[PDB]
Point group: D2
Chain length 293, copies 4
Amino acid sequence: PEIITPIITPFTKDNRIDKEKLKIHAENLIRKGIDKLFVNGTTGLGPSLSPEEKLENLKAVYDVTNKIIFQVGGLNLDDAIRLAKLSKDFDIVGIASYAPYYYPRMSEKHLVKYFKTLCEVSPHPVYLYNYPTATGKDIDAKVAKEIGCFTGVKDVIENIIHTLDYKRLNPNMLVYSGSQMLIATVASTGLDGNVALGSNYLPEVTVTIKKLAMERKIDEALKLQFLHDEVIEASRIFGSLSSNYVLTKYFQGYDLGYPRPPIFPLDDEEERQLIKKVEGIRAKLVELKILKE
Amino acid sequence: PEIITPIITPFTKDNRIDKEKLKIHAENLIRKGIDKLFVNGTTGLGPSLSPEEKLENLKAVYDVTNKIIFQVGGLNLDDAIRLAKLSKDFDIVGIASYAPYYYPRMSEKHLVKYFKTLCEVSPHPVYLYNYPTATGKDIDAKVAKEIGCFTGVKDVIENIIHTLDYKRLNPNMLVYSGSQMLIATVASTGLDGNVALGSNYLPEVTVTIKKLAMERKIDEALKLQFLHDEVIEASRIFGSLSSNYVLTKYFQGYDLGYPRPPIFPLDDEEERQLIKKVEGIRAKLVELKILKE
Amino acid sequence: PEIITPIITPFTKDNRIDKEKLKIHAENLIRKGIDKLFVNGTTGLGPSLSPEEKLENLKAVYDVTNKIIFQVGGLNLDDAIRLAKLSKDFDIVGIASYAPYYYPRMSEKHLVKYFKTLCEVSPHPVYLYNYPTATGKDIDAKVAKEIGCFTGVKDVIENIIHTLDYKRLNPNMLVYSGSQMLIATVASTGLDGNVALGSNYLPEVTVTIKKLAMERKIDEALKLQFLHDEVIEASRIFGSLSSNYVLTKYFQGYDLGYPRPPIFPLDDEEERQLIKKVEGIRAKLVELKILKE
Amino acid sequence: PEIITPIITPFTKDNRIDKEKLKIHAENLIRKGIDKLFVNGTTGLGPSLSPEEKLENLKAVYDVTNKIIFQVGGLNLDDAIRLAKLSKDFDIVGIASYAPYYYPRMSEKHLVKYFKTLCEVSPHPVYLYNYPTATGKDIDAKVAKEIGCFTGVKDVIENIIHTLDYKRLNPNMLVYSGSQMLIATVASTGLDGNVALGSNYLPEVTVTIKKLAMERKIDEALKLQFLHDEVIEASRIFGSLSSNYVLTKYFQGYDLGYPRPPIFPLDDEEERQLIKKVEGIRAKLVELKILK
């Protein structure tokens, strides 16, 4: 079982990547037991980044670790190809792409051709990043088998049978769930792990749930799952992708800068309200010895 | 954890409930280890049954077992009230209702009042039957808490975090998933069991997956899960609610008659095509000693 | 260019059809210039009515007028067949059915077979009642052509090209829009009329918009269209199907009884709030000489 | 009322904007009666263009006409701001933006702030480009009123009451429908015109339908509407955004190059089947003297 963090991209006030804060964050995640870092995913505002910026993020995290999956996709296939080729000089886990987003009613043949083109140019294993609520497209287990060249899939969906279908139809594929329900996906149900959307700000909780689940301490894991879920709900009040910055600073104790507008930062009042909603959870996690005081 | 079968309603060729086939089927399910029978659910074509027929189903299954959850809902609240009251004389597990279907944009206040009215008249525990893809409405954990009178919920959805939310917000509620992914939901993830949509025709597989999962024989449970999933996929070719009849006859060895049009019966060609698609699965299950040749 | 009213079903406090109030309402609508009355549609709570109740509604309206389309559909095809046959003794415009509702993932073959069965037994022209938001199914122009036996379609959808497609692919079919935008569908865009959701409580507005639109007085019709839309929006505050009763009493001056729970009646305070929301609209309609005070 | 064409962006075989084919196309549309050109819309593959390419498109079309609405939106607000400011030196009709796409569950507050920011820096009138099926967001008449700074809206949706709501709640706003049903939106329903997604390849049909409609000749307008609809249905066989290139070449007689992958071009065989599907429609339009 592995935990993959879709790592946040810190931006400066000038709306450029803050490489030093990114390095600090990646170092903390690896130190806290995260297995692999997924760079330029939704949580990292991948679609908001130019190709150059996607490459910047890779370079900053690569200084720290090579346990990286490098998301390269976009609506200009030539740029995705150029990022795939540029990744050759990095001894990472793989590259990845979401399906082409925005445009409705794209044919299956064109979607398959997009992914097969990336596979044909990739110097690394290729991972499917399936995120239907954001892309409008589902690249399901059958289409993945037709594409035929994925080493793995990250299925960011709450429909857990949909994720298991990949393993059934592609027994050699590494299959990761992005379900919020870590207990039922990270270990012992047929999958290889979880792409954990809350692991940026509470990697200790994610990692401990994984351990407890592997030990079958389900009641103990549930208690932590529920605290995790309360933080997720609180993060949705003002926008989860923006709230992730405030929560990482609060729980992990270092600043992660700003998101990129139109993913606007929480304003002062929103930040204080969000902290009020989670300060009792922090206290409980300290009592449980999950977090340090 | 417990397995709940949403039991099929067998109809005769002239569209009457076949009470004797229903009793044979109910007896087989209990004998094969199903814990409880859910009567007049989607799988039982509940919405296609008059209130008089819904009661007729209860009476037939009650001749076999009292481990019944009696679905009574509909768009005439007086009929649902009458069925709830008629159930006083039956020593059953509970009554249940789906949310009012068909009408779009029903107010939360009116949905809450519908369920609270049933609770006020029920002589038994009341179960929420949540089936958003059919009713067009979701009665989520928060609305369930507001209603405040459910003894349990059957959450027929693949979104497993949605199901866990009921247990987090309502710790005393019995919470059952209708996910196809038995191996995750039946045991060891904090729910009370599974409403197993495929357990009419392969109760042995459902019950064995549960046993293997509880024993931590996950590789063995997975092989059976996949066989189950292949059958579910084949059932979708011609329509699962109709295919359920052919599959029960094939795997369990007794006739269950016909569905009720517009849930049309598979014709003979469709029956033969479906059987060809699953006969290798049957042979595998015989080899595995799950079924008898 | 015809206006069709999907007529309300008035119920008594005892939750039975109020035949006398239905007769008075039907008489008023015809007297105010509505062309045809559509009985047992969504606005009439069709799916909440037993087959016998659907037939009662036909009889009560038929005493008044033979300008009826009789909705007979449901989830027991035998009952819909019964009703179709029972209509033979009524010299009405046609019968109608929505598609089978509730059950998801019904095959095109089965949906086609449902409607072809009704056509085979019908003693009257058969009309498609297309309401995808309520039924979960779209019987579009292509499927209607495949069914091949509809005399007309009522397309209750805001997608106006969807409605025109029926006329393009079925040039001999009568095609009515259920769009809220009367001005654009009641005349001069290739359709045969509108099924007017608000014509129960303001038939005068509906009929006046029709005449103004034919007389090429689009500025005048727009003003009334806007007042009509403001009333529609106010009806959604507490639930449109319930608010339609209060609005008919307020604008037309006679009582229409109660809806059938779970379509709950507005309580006395909700009624007061709704009337305040439309008080100024009534005054404007009186000033414009469309309603007598 | 007006016809607005969301103009195609022609690309070369090596995936560069073909400025000289774009100018040929723009000049033809204007010559055939199109009122305004909407640049970097969905049909122009706006989200597939860098901000630098979005400006390139403006500069090329501006060589032909100033009757331009310049779409500048994207997921880096600083780039949209730059494009809005760069537009100052172009004497055009307005700028436009779609709502931020991709990210789900964006708050109304953040959506409003995005548009109000563009309004604060824009040297031209600002148009809302509402396309819920592509962006996942609906900026409806109520939210547009709250934003309060739109000169106009292009509502790319088949729900015609949704579009009229903008005029009811914002009486001074210019309101255009992107409905396929031209004959109901190009005149006599309270709207200011139509953003016509088939007008790239059959501008004659769009403009003639508008004329006939205004002239109350609804029977003849309907016959053209149906032919237009048959071509649109054919365009969906292999992909509408890709098929629009083949159809423009076939009906207008000049080459428009290629789309940008993953909007892949039709292959030679796909092109032949599409042409076979519409060849009878072309002959009919010629007979009717719509085409020559």
